[PDB]
Design a protein around this ligand. Structure first.
Ligand SMILES: O=P(O)(O)OC[C@@H](O)[C@@H](O)[C@H](O)[C@H](O)CO
Ligand SMILES: O=P(O)(O)OC[C@@H](O)[C@@H](O)[C@H](O)[C@H](O)CO
Ligand SMILES: [Cl-]
Ligand SMILES: [Cl-]
Ligand SMILES: [Cl-]
Ligand SMILES: [Mg+2]
Lengths: 682, 685
């Protein structure tokens, strides 16, 4: 049962104009233009304000009081409605920000829903179908269907009666003083949203709850509806689109093959209407924009996940990058460490444009996710961003205001993704182009007035849509990824509170430590073992029984010490361990060289190998596989990276001396480690 | 792990040419043509038969012995491969029937899968991408990557090693003599499929399992493959398309708004590549054919379910209707009672053309009637006699095909033509505005030659101009039906095709689910209509607003459910789900009037009908029947007041039905007094 502010709610009834849609402001202009053309004067602001919530019949009676019994209101209204339907035909129904997010929350909560509007059925059905919100309502009650319109309670009492609920079990959404009175008298749980009239004390008194805008009600409603569970593999994305735009700065492997799935799942109720991703790969950009979508292939389940509403922009195109930072609510920076410095100038330009623009998107702060498998990624990005903003604005006050306005969130990503090579994309485009060519070979009770009009609609639609019919079973595969779902994100941004694929953490350091030791540690040691055994990738190495056994034992050893050091992360350790082993199995596009790089840095006392050894020695847990991994590291540095034996031993003795162990444990470790290194050289 | 005939398998390694695809017959023709051109003569049939399973390098050595050390086999093979790739680019890769159905079952069973082919890597990857099967394999092993090709086991050993499995844990699929020897020598669990060569005694002995075609293995695998659970609301359809075609004879509310979802879910592993639906509504027909798809709207969850691969044909088009009966595997007849007479002539023409041109057709009867199969088979057999004039052929057609009546609980409403016109007008305007918002030159891309970039620019430009107008279809649905969320269809057991369909519930006897439909669905519906009419309401949905009518429906559905659980305890789980589904569908049934449902009260008040039979069952099993007794009293009150049935004539019927009920003399006299008192109490109000 949906509980809202202590009250059990079973239904929700909405006023349409001014509450769901921003159509009262447009109607003010059409009625003013139609009255100017017919009675030589515009309808006053006072008359049009008094009309809010009234049906065309009651608004006609009000026009006869102020302008005279012979006022041609029916002719003025008819002309205004025609101009209004023409504006809606050219630009669409202006939907109040957050409406579909609210509707999907109430629908998924099991509420019976209705519209109670003073507008006539024809206009109401036009706007509800045009805005694609008609599907959310069981009942529609209109102004031309009630004897006593607003402020009389009849229309709300009738909508509640048609939903088979008492008015007091219904939330009633209103914007006008007349409408609010109708809903309040009916006995509904009134929710007043500000539209044109600044609510007076009488409106604020009878309203059960008041919000300045639909988004503010959405924020309150979120406290009464749950955060959806972590998505499963193959679970579909939400159908409904909200009005938000999200951005992926860097359409590489993790951005396209992972962040896009996170952003497409959004909160489970709705998903962004547009995802802007930036890349310098022209082939990738043009391919996505030709299809409108791309797909992520998950080899394990042979499942192609389609990422809809994608828009790929050129990274070097200043105007497209400004649009991403000006229209987006969330931006995920998915750049390599090498690109941070040069890209910070583009991030600065976009954040400065967001600061200067007067749009209704730049008012809310931006949530900036920093996606980088490096400890201190947030600090590296923030330092470069501050430098770039300072030289661009040449104003310390503007720079500080920008860096304090937004939520810069550090993250822990575990999913392994591989971006398709340009040669493989080219081959895919060549094969699917021939399919498109073959598809083009195969395809080559109404009045007569509207039956001929329908023939034009259907012909124009068949001509434009037919070539794209092949997209029903044709995907643009761009990424091959693993099945790891959760992204660990720093808590703080309120925009992250409902994202179902995000795991919020108060401090990111604990899951960063787990990532470093359990994931990166076992990965670097597995790469050193595989490099010395002659394998060029982890996936090929996993074919060797001794390599697969080493990986299973090495992760079981690290996890054992981590379960004691961080018992609050016990389930995460079990999940990440199996995730690592599953992702290592067929990792053919994961070369050993990149994973085994910088072995002396990875063999430091506080790094991914020696720190786990010290923990297992301090808690009397086995460490033979961890010792073998450390020995493989020093052997790899000497045999492959040409590091002198004298420097490897000097580094070995320095890190062991830095470890928090007894003198006996340090000596035993040093002797066992040097013994294994000498044994490897045979 | 997968238990296939007792054998535990962790992997599945497949040969490509001849096993997965029918490319050995095409390669035979291209090699005959290429040799004819370059050496003046066609390669002998014996040389090409010996080449089956061999790599291009091994086939070259064999050609040097039989034709001379200086034969241009490399030139002939390159020329034959180019003619084959041209044929494959046009017609597509010819997939062996059932391949994707097999791959998806092995993949969902958690098997590690690989391809071990004597074909060149560039040819193999191209064919697997083309046929959309590449995604089913973790690793591919090709003929140009081993030192010794088939019949040497190296390639099947390497495919198992790269899968990280022992060869004796992998099912190995083969078709040729050379390929089978490579698989058998590797120690894998060999499965032989018949391709070009007739399997000799040496091959039949080597093979652990033998099948004449890929579809035979699919039927054998289905014995060890678990059937998928009943689909849930909003659960997506399978991504993989099989090669089957299905048909819906009658694209109305039940055909388009229900059967299409069952056919789209299919078995959960794959779904038919094409669903042909017939209709006389040219506005509906041309709309689906313009969009490519249509959607079913489920108001309860505000969910639009898109139905893909639909092909709407004209019911009067003889050619299109004949094509539906010859290409389809399953056909659902979704036409009303009145159309049966005229449409039976079209079904007769289609079924006659099917046996003139292989597998038995599974025909589903989708019509609301206990014995609707009789009406269809009566007019169908009469149409076959006046068209074929042969009783011996007519008897063979009706005996081979799987004709089966069904029980449908879902209520669906077809969109009106006026509402469809408004929708077309609003969506056309969206397309028109989208076209106002909307050549490509790709450069500076690494690892691609300047000519490859120019060629990619052409492909992508052609794709952009063709797909761009249809980009709006990602969030634009062609809503044609408004449907309830009732999922299971009850079908007569018999057809083996219906054994794996996840949305189909097979029954031992259809009489049992027809009786449940009569007492639980039609029974409570009639008793609700009688109550609503006497209360003053003229609609079922309007009556649900009255709290006493809603509680009466919940109390009626509970008393009938308890009784039906004693008589038919096999449908205990079905009864509880059908009860809630009935209440959810009655809630907003404003479209359905009360006069239609409350029609003929005395016939529905018979001892064996939807009211008294439930009362007698409850009395005999000491279950409560107070609301069922009120429902019977409302039926007589409605007949007396609304239908001008004499009060004495209603009491005589009341006494006769109670006497026909299997109850004791004491229970009959108690029921009669209880019923008469309730009828007199209704007149007092
Ligand atoms: O009950 P609603 O808020 O859905 O719609 C009321 C409008 O029709 C009404 O406010 C008119 O726009 C107004 O009366 C015209 O001046
Ligand atoms: O191992 P497969 O069955 O996937 O492929 C074998 C073919 O490459 C081979 O049979 C050629 O078609 C043959 O060598 C041409 O004459
Ligand atoms: Cl929104
Ligand atoms: Cl700002
Ligand atoms: Cl200041
Ligand atoms: Mg990070």
């Amino acid at each position: 049962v949906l509980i809202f502010h202590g009250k059990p709610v079973h239904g929700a009834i909405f006023a349409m104009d001014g509450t769901m849609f921003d159509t009262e402001r447009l109607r003010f202009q059409t009625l003013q233009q139609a009255s100017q053309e017919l009675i030589g004067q515009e309808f006053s602001h006072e008359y049009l304000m008094q009309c809010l919530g009234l049906s065309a019949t009651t608004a006609e009676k009000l026009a006869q009081r102020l302008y005279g019994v012979d006022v041609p209101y029916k002719e003025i209204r008819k002309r205004a409605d025609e101009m209004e339907l023409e504006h809606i035909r050219k630009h669409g129904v202006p939907i109040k920000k957050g409406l579909v997010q609210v509707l999907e929350r109430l629908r998924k909560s099991g509420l019976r829903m209705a519209v109670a509007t003073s507008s006539r059925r024809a206009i109401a059905e036009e706007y509800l179908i045009n805005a694609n919100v008609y599907k959310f309502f069981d009942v529609i009650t209109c102004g031309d269907e009630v004897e006593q319109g607003k402020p009389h309670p009849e229309i709300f009492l009738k909508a509640a009666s048609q939903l088979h609920l008492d008015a007091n079990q219904c939330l009633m959404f209103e914007d006008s003083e007349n409408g609010l009175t109708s809903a309040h008298t009916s006995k509904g749980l009134t929710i007043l949203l500000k539209d044109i009239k600044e609510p007076n004390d009488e409106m604020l008194e009878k309203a059960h709850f008041y919000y300045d805008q639909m988004y503010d009600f959405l924020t309150d409603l979120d406290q009464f509806i749950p955060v959806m569970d972590m998505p499963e593999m193959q679970e579909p994305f939400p159908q409904s689109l909200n009005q938000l735009t999200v951005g992926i700065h860097g359409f590489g492997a993790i951005g396209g093959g992972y962040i896009a799935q996170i952003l497409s799942h959004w909160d489970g109720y709705t998903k962004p209407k547009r995802i802007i991703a930036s890349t310098r790969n022209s082939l990738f950009r043009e391919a996505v924009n030709a299809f409108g979508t791309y797909s992520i292939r998950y080899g394990q389940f042979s499942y192609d996940e389609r990422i809809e509403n994608m828009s790929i922009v050129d990274s070097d195109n200043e105007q497209q990058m400004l649009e991403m930072y000006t229209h987006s609510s969330l931006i995920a920076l998915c750049l390599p460490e090498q690109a941070i410095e040069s890209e910070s100038k583009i991030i600065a330009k976009g954040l400065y444009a967001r600061f200067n623009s007067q749009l209704e998107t730049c008012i809310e702060p931006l949530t900036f996710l920093i996606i980088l498998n490096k400890v201190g990624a947030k600090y590296l990005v923030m330092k470069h961003l501050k430098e770039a903003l300072l030289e661009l604005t040449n104003d310390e006050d503007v720079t500080e205001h920008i860096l304090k306005e937004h939520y810069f969130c550090d993250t822990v990503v575990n999913r392994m993704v591989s971006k398709l090579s340009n040669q493989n994309l080219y081959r895919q485009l060549r094969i699917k182009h021939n399919f498109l060519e073959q598809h083009l070979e195969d395809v080559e009770k109404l009045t007569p007035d509207q039956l001929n009009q329908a023939s034009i609609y259907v012909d124009n639609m068949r001509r434009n849509f037919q070539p794209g019919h092949i997209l029903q079973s044709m995907d643009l595969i761009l990424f091959h990824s693993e099945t790891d779902m959760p992204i660990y994100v720093e808590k703080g941004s309120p925009l992250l509170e409902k994202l179902r694929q995000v795991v919020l953490v108060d401090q990111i350091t604990d899951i960063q430590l787990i990532k470093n030791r359990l994931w990166n540690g076992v990965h670097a040691m597995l790469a050193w073992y595989a490099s010395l055994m002659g394998y060029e990738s982890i996936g090929v190495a996993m074919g060797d029984h001794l390599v697969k056994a080493f990986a299973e034992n090495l992760i079981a050893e690290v996890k054992q010490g981590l379960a004691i050091v961080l018992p609050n992360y016990a389930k995460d350790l079990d999940r990440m361990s199996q995730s690592f082993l599953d992702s290592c199995e067929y990792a053919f596009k994961d070369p050993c060289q990149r994973v085994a790089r910088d072995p002396l840095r990875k063999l430091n006392h506080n790094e991914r190998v020696m720190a786990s050894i010290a923990v297992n020695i301090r808690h009397d847990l086995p460490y033979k596989n961890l010792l073998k991994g450390a020995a493989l590291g020093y052997a790899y540095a000497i045999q492959f990276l040409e590091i002198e034996e004298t420097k490897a031993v000097e580094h070995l003795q320095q890190q062991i001396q830095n470890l928090d162990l007894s003198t006996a444990q340090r000596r035993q470790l040093e002797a066992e480690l040097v013994q294994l290194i000498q044994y490897l050289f045979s």
